[PDB]
Amino acid sequence: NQFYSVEVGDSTFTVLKRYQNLKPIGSGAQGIVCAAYDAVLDRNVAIKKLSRPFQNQTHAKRAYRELVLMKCVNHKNIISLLNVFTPQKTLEEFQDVYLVMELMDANLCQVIQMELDHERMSYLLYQMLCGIKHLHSAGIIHRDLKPSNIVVKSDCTLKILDFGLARTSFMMTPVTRYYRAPEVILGMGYKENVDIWSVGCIMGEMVRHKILFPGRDYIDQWNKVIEQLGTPCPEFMKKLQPTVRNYVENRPKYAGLTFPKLFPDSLFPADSEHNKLKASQARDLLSKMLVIDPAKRISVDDALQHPYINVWYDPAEVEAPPPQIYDKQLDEREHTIEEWKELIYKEVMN
Ligand SMILES: CCCCCCCCCCCC[N+](C)(C)CCCS(=O)(=O)O
Ligand SMILES: O=C(Nc1nnc(-c2ccncc2)s1)C(F)(F)Br
Fold first, then answer.
1. What's the CATH number for 106-319?
2. Which of 118, 222, 322, 326 pairs as cysteine with 137 (C-beta 3.0–4.6 A)?
3. Catalytic entry in 96, 144, 162, 331
4. Sign (positive/negative) of CA torsion 213, 219, 222, 226?
5. Residues forming the annotated binding site for ATP?
């Protein structure tokens, strides 16, 4: 037998014998993740056991799309698949999927808690924009980027873990919704720069060490948006739905706080000329990402040209060729659970 079983993270992992000393590092609706030592490669890996991938079609579609995209994308800021396996021997008995990834050291939530340092902050944001640009060039518009879905190594290298809605913006989760763009929440449709709002939310959270737009539901979240950024222009209420406009237009009108008041100098490293320069540049970039109307919001390509980020720009990292997803009808075609299962089983078997 090439497999062995170990109970870890209150779950039974049945894995290849090359993977040793499993230790829980994370959990969620998608699955349970362990760190492990891979004796074949002499390196530490992360193993994700997918949680109930065939419980329904949303789980099955998510599992198939995650597996296909993690194989096909090859980029330093997107997590890569090192191995995938199932311990079951037939399609009839097939139930469990294990993804093996390179082990990162922390997620971005943990990193966000550290004291803001402009070299680290700008580098993390640069890498996020690099990964997002690469996903966008393949038609993958994430729409649910959040700090828990982004992992970081001790040397501050950064990888995005998941693909959001991919080449599909309704999201049935069955969650953390504080990073979703106004045009997603309000049901207006989206373009590529929907993901820039989420980066802006993460960036503002790195500076304030508080969630920018927290709240129990989207009603509360929208109130936090307009209180801080101001009631949007009627050119936006016009693009808005004639029904949902009524609630939004009848909210109290807010001027919004200026970005100097939203992100005051008190939040930034002080008392060097370099730090004074960088506070102004960071606030300027925030003011161009945290824009309610996506028609007025900076693009990924222009954010990479912004002076706060562009110090890091290397064409070899930014301008890599787009992945060719030959598997069309992905994120559009629906299938029965049995059909998704066969599709996933073929992908696991390579
Ligand atoms: C303060 C919270 C308000 C929540 C408002 C809920 C709004 C309901 C959304 C329905 C919009 C459907 N259409 C217009 C067809 C666009 C669908 C395309 S996409 O899904 O927006 O990409
Ligand atoms: O946390 C989750 N997913 C993850 N996927 N990969 C992860 C990882 C962690 C550390 N190093 C490498 C990879 S954690 C979830 F299941 F709750 Br959606």
1. 1.10.510.10
2. 322
3. 144
4. negative
5. 25-33, 48
